[PDB]
Design a protein around this ligand. Sequence first.
Ligand SMILES: [Cl-]
Ligand SMILES: [Cl-]
Ligand SMILES: [Cl-]
Ligand SMILES: [Cl-]
Lengths: 189, 189, 188, 188, 148, 149, 149, 148
Amino acid sequence: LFDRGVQMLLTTVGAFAAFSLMTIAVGTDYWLYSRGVCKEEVMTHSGLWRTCCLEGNFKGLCKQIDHFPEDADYEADTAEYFLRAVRASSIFPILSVILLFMGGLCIAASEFYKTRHNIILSAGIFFVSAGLSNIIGIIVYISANAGSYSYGWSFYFGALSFIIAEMVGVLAVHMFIDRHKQLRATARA
Amino acid sequence: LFDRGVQMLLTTVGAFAAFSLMTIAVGTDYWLYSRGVCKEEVMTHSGLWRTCCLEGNFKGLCKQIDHFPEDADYEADTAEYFLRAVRASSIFPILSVILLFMGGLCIAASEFYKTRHNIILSAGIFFVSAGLSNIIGIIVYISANAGSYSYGWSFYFGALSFIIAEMVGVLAVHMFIDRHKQLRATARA
Amino acid sequence: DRGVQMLLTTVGAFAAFSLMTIAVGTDYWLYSRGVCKTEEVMTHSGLWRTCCLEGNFKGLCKQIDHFPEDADYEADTAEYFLRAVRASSIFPILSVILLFMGGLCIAASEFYKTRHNIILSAGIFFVSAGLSNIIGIIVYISANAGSYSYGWSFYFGALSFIIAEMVGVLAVHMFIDRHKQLRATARA
Amino acid sequence: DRGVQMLLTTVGAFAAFSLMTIAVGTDYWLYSRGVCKTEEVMTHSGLWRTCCLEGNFKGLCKQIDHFPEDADYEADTAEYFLRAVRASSIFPILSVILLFMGGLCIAASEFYKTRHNIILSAGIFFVSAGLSNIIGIIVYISANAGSYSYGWSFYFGALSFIIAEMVGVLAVHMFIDRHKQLRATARA
Amino acid sequence: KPGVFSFLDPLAYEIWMCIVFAYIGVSVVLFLVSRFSPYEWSTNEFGIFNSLWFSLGAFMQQGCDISPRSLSGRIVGGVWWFFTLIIISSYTANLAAFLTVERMVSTSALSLSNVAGVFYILVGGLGLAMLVALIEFCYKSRAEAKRM
Amino acid sequence: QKSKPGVFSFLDPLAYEIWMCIVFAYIGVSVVLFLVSRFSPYEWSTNEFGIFNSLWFSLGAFMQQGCDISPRSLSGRIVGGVWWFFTLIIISSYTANLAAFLTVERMTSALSLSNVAGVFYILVGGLGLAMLVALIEFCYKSRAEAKRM
Amino acid sequence: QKSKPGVFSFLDPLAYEIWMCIVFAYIGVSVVLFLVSRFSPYEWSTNEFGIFNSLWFSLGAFMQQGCDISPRSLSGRIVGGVWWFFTLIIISSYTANLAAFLTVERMTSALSLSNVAGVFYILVGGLGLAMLVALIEFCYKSRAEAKRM
Amino acid sequence: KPGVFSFLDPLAYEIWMCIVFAYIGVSVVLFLVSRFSPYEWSTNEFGIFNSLWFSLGAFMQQGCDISPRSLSGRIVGGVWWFFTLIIISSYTANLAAFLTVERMVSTSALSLSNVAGVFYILVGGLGLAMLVALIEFCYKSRAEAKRM
Ligand SMILES: [Cl-]
Ligand SMILES: [Cl-]
Ligand SMILES: [Cl-]
Ligand SMILES: [Cl-]
């Protein structure tokens, strides 16, 4: 919002925080609390890949999430199988992770060859796209889950990561705006 | 829309036409076509005051409209009695007639003592108010009637009179606008 | 005029404060049928007690019980929070306090003509008192929900809110006018 | 550019006219199951005749009867007016005529460069042809109402409407540009 | 077999007629109060043509290029706004009631036959607008050609 | 049996307490918008939100009729946003409860004029009131102009 | 049994033919508005209703999102009025038929995200498309600026 | 006994959360496409603060002081408009369904208890707005008094 050194640090720490939160969300199996089987229905905590027992006879037992169930799955249309494939792959959370990492790489590389103002713009675009990918992944996850339950901290770690991504993306575009604004003043000099 | 002599003539003939149509509507008993008794249910034509038989055993027999029926009317609150009184009196169509006549008197009187520009404004106000009174009378009539049928030409004579009243009222205000606009030009020079 | 506006502001502030004080103290908020000194009979109730009307025990007041724990029920905590808010009548009382503070600021503004921020504080107090009145009305009706009519004490409170809003508007007009006149001299 | 814009306009006008002419003449407007040459079998129908498909009498066309007077029914006259409108196909045909007239105006404009009102007439003709296409589509679907799919003849007509509106927009751009260039010379 | 103009069913014909009359009265009164006073001469663009446009936009709940600024004009606009809000909500609520009650009678989606009438009105209005524009263009061109 | 609808039966979907609180909330919103738009001498004005203009803006927002002016400061925009959300919820609630009333009858046909006679009466009363106010202003200025001259 | 709602199940209240004709009518209205606003050389422009602006005005009118510009001529106002009436009727019909669908189930609970997943997908697709278009314009101007210099 | 925030029932909580996220994403993208290009420097008043205001007004279907003029900004605005129209119609339709189904279960008017939460939100927003205005006034006065 003011000066340049503080804005650099704020954007860098925001990128690092969003990347860490999204990576933790991807790698941790606390996205949903619901009754289920982890091998009789009992309370479970589930993520993107595996679900583990909570307060059951065998606590701490994890099994891979059944994305394409066997034994007469009743089939589905191309749209529903496609959604199941996007859910199983979790590409959009991973795509968000990749875009956040590449935006951070652009921000770090902007220290070297500071005349290349197109790097900061690319970082801003990357962070905005990472937020959009996060939104799509959240919608896909909720839709696949739905069809009593609670959302865990890894789901809300992803929600917070999306928010930080847009705020960091907003700051990066401001720098591109200010860097080109500064170039107009000196040329007029 | 242009000149002054034609606008005078247009406003005068509009006032005369609206007054004649409203007076014909008030004094003629063709406002509604419905089955009823004019002394067994038969097709009837009814107005504001009396209803007469149509294609019955005794055609052309008229009786006064029962506004406050006898023989266990079941009564009502003050609101419905007040509505029935406004219906029976028909003070809004008659008030519209009076306002139209007074606006016409102002328009005719405006030619004598032409310096009194406030007369034309008064005529415009009278015509606008006559239209508003016509609207209220129509709403009261339709509400009281409905509390298969068709509306006759006397009802639509009143509808046309309201339209002419507003158009004549619009023209009268234009004259007041132009008369005072003309006084500014001559004072400017 | 400055004098007329100040007179209108002080009269309105006093009227709003007095109406709200009388509404909080009186018992004609609601007419409804209910038991007394706990037979159905029409009564009148306020914010702290209900009294029988035209009954066998006419004229006898019984304190309103805001926690009907006969069955010892709690359900959710939102109901208990609402009941605690309603029983204390914290919002009508806060509206009274804010009206009194605004009147105090208006009175003290005469002593210190140089200090223009007192008028602004009075305006803020009056607007906040009106908002407190709004919240209190909402809470009262909601608590009543979980035939009847509203008595003149209820409309004493409602009329107090409208007056407090107007006097708050007038006070802000004075803060603006004082700053405008100061700048007309400063620019000149 | 003047040349590029004129070439685009004439190509679009020709394409819209040809698509609408083919849509009106062909029989792949709707796929539905129905009897022929008056057994249920899937057929294809256009605006004048319906022909059996993959059936015992596959390839045989029967004229569509637009007045199902088996029971000698009339009901209201709005239905009869709608059937008369649909049976004649007056609106798709009028769209074809308007497209042809607009193309004629576009072609004749080269001969008379001085006359700028021909371009405006061509634009009006193209826009009116699009509107005629809209009304015809609405009438056709409404008549069908009183499983199925739409064939490529239906979408030939739909694609004709979009092209006609675009070429009409381009033609109006030329009428504007011709008048602007005339005034630049006149002012200069 | 829904009628062509069956989209008008939720309100009675008397309501539609009175809506037209009320619209005319509101437009006329707005023009009267906005323009009659020589002492306000004007600071507002509310002629009879602009008043009718304002009232039509208000009933359709669409954007306004101008809004009344005086007390009387704002009174007229406010009462017209209240009337419009009530009437439009009533239309939507009665349409929902019609469709729901027809659904529980012992396909689902609305068909084009239910709104063909509003489509016809729209296209007829487009045609009338084009005719008005071309007539104005022709009259202006004749005036200009005869002028010089 | 179904009785003849009352004159002001269009207010039925919402309870009388809701209408009263809507009026109170409208007054409070208008006053607070005027206060936060104009009290600060450092904003002198940049905006146009006087008391009359604030009342007009709030009335237009509740009737969803757009705005000739829009707040630009953070606090004015907070007021506008909360008023917008309130208006959306309340109008949707009116429409939904009216639909429920018209669908299920307790103890379907087209709405008759008697269902909306009251809003027609209010409209015509408002037109007459505006006419009276405009005439009174004109008459006041006509005497004042002649008095000065 | 009740099946899981489809992705684009928010289009269910209106038939596919209605949506197709809505698109066609929107195109026709935009083209006619542009034609009647700008063809006449005697109006040269006084208005701002080019083809792009006319499309924007018609889109805003259908979504009931106001207008940065409003037509001023008689013919443009006729186009705007008929489009407004059409939009009012169609939007009310969508809402009413959705209410009927949600009330009576053939062969009540809160709407789940699956009921409206498709609008979210379309929204994010539009955001990505706008980003791509803006980037392509910027890249085109960056090469063109350097080319000239 | 309706809950305080029972006006939010017709839509699930996931829909509300996604509405907030979509609003944020739309505002950010609108600011990005409106302002990032030095070649458009600006001709539009679409900063991040103004873009959020535009998106909020668009979702609430209220008036706009500004509207996008460029192609990308108009794309963002159009898709947001479509989203808003669908979502608001869905809220109204599901509320009507809730009320009708509750009515056909073996008083009638909506009570203040059904909508007390929106009133609480409105008054809390008025208080927060006043606090923001007074804090800004105090900070500016301290800045001015210390300046001279
Ligand atoms: Cl996992
Ligand atoms: Cl008679
Ligand atoms: Cl008490
Ligand atoms: Cl054929």
